[PDB]
Amino acid sequence: LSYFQALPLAQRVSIMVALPFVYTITWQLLYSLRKDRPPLVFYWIPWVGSAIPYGTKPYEFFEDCQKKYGDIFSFMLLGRIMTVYLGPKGHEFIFNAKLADVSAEAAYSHLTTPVFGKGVIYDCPNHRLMEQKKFVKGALTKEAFVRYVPLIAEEIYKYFRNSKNFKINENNSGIVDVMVSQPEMTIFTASRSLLGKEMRDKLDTDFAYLYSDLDKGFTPINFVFPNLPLEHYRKRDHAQQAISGTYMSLIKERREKNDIQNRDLIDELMKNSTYKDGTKMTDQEIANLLIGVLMGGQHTSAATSAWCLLHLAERPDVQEELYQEQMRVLNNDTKELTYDDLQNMPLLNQMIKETLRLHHPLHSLFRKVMRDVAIPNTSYVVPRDYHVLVSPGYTHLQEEFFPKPNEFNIHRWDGGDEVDYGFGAISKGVSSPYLPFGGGRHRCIGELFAYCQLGVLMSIFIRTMKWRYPTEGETVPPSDFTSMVTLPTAPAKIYWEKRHPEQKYG
Ligand SMILES: CC[C@@H](C)n1ncn(-c2ccc(N3CCN(c4ccc(OC[C@H]5CO[C@](Cn6cncn6)(c6ccc(Cl)cc6Cl)O5)cc4)CC3)cc2)c1=O
Ligand code: HEM
Ligand SMILES: [Cl-]
Ligand SMILES: [Cl-]
């Protein structure tokens, strides 16, 4: 190092920028000597790790890692080490892990707690979240869906009429960007049914911008830096307070009038948000919980109906097959749609089921390791402070589980023990290769709402329109895996025409 100082400046600079790369390469060579750790995927760039391949093609990244290291491998991701366990055995290891070994709230809270607010979901012990899930299910019964279906349909028909994306009472055909239309239709239908009429109407005012601001705070870049003094972090914090304050205001007005019925999720939480220990949720916490429930249905559902429309755009045979089922179940379109009719549209539901296979909206689910965990039938130990990463969406796309996994075939769906974590009996095992809604204690409680919402929506699209791509030979767009959910690359335009030009919608 006395030789170093004699070198020309450009060399001394080269050596000094090279030093971090040599140090991390050296540290990875020393790391591979531990046989009690999963293989660490090799990476060139200090700290960044494998962010680029993982962030842009996670399933292809996983597949190449699998061929080289097996089902269990670690990778460096923006200063954090993620341990992946691919396949059914991984579903079981992670989704069914013990509370003492891994924590979802420790992995997610710095991202969700500023968006939803304090005291609920991931800003509370797990046993409280189990009971919050039980409360919310009180508004997700069959009887609730019976009520929701005509409200969701009414919202969709208003949208067809009023939205500049359609204006369907004046145009017989059009081009629409499903990445514009579907997020909007999703928030209108979920508002009207879960928050009710008062809150749905506020979306016709400038209040709607607050939801947009709240959404902007909900990006994966908040996983790494949950708080910067940035403008859009400020707008997010304002929105959470303005929105939750508005829900509390509505909650209070209802309590004064005793206007507490069986209409929406606000009614349900006002009547049934008392924990087993006799304590109960505050209005601020009810409002924060409402924010989280709506947000959990927003991106997953909008992404999914966008993919349905796109896969059907290139399949007029499937559109026609679904249209035939619609005419059988709804008596040639003389019966108003009801929840029982959706339960009798098997092909419609297989179409949603198949879209969710091809496009799981959440490609990666995470838990933080809370104490060293041995991995059964390996020599690996995953140490405290790593993260484990489970990816059912990877298994959806695997030839071993689904022959010709990239083909959209709704007829592949032609056709154990239970455990109660506190929100109802669910499947005890999670070894299925197909888990669009997760499994174990953190499993989705919105699955039937999603089928209800998506089912009304696709039922009405099929009965009202035919559509295709605007250019011949165009196909399904590629996915963008960098956002909250995997969603199609925008814009994603389809050409539609009314099946009944004379029909007026409202
Ligand atoms: C620098 C290069 C660049 C290309 N790059 N480098 C890295 N990345 C990247 C990394 C990771 C990701 N991922 C990982 C995180 N992921 C994600 C994982 C889980 C998740 O949510 C799980 C929890 C929290 O939110 C919900 C979602 N939900 C559940 N049911 C329906 N939605 C949730 C649960 C309950 C409630 Cl009430 C609300 C919500 Cl939102 O569950 C959201 C996003 C998004 C993509 C994206 C990009 C990049 O883009
Ligand atoms: C097609 C639509 C949807 C899909 C694919 C989906 C998927 C998922 C998945 C994979 C999880 C587990 C997350 C994990 O294990 O880390 C989950 C959890 C959850 N989702 Fe959904 N979801 C959808 C719609 C909805 C809707 C409509 C709601 C509410 C109305 C909702 C609310 C929730 C809640 C409350 C949880 C519990 C989180 C926990 O217990 O930690 N989701 N969802
Ligand atoms: Cl009109
Ligand atoms: Cl459930």
CB distance 294 to ligand 2 below 6 Å:
no
Distance CA 80, CA 429 (A): 29
Which residues, at least 6 apart from 108, have a Cβ–Cβ distance to it below 8 Å? 122, 366
Strand order in the sheet with 465-468: 173-177, 493-498, 465-468
CB distance 297 to ligand 2 below 6 Å:
yes
Distance 296 CA to ligand 2 centre (A): 6
DSSP conformation class of 344: T
| Domain spans of the chain, in order of start | 4-498
3-state secondary structure 426-481: EECCCCCCCCCCCCHHHCCCCHHHHHHHHHHHHHHHHHHEEEECCCCCCCCCCEEC
Of 121, 225, 484, 487, the residue with max ligand 1 atoms within 8 A of its CB, to mutate for a pocket test, comes to 484
Q: Which fold has domain 4-498?
A: Cytochrome p450 (1.10.630)
Looking at this protein, which amino acid is placed at residue 282? T
CB distance 93 to ligand 2 below 6 Å:
no
**Cis amide bond preceding 491, omega within 30:** yes
Distance 172 CA to ligand 3 centre (A): 13
Distance CA 487, CA 361 (A): 7
CB distance 75 to ligand 1 below 6 Å:
no
Nearest CA to ligand 2 atom 7: 437
Distance 455 CA to ligand 2 centre (A): 17
Q: How far is CA 65 from CA 49, 248, 433, 482, in A?
A: 14, 49, 19, 19
Instruction: Name the CA radius of gyration of the chain, rounded.
Output: 25
Q: Which spans in 138-278 are helix H?
A: 142-162, 178-190, 197-202, 208-216, 221-224, 231-257, 265-271
Q: Residues 318, 410: contact at Cβ < 8 Å? A: yes
Q: Residues 135, 272: contact at Cβ < 8 Å? A: yes
Place of tokens 């009520």: 147
Q: How far is CA 443 from CA 95, 133, 273, 287, 429, in A?
A: 8, 10, 20, 22, 12
CB distance 301 to ligand 1 below 6 Å:
no
- Strand 387-390 and strand 80-85: the pairing is parallel
Using the atom order of ligand 1, give the atom closest to the CA of residue 444.
30
Q: What is the resolution of this structure in A?
A: 2.4
Annotated binding site: 444
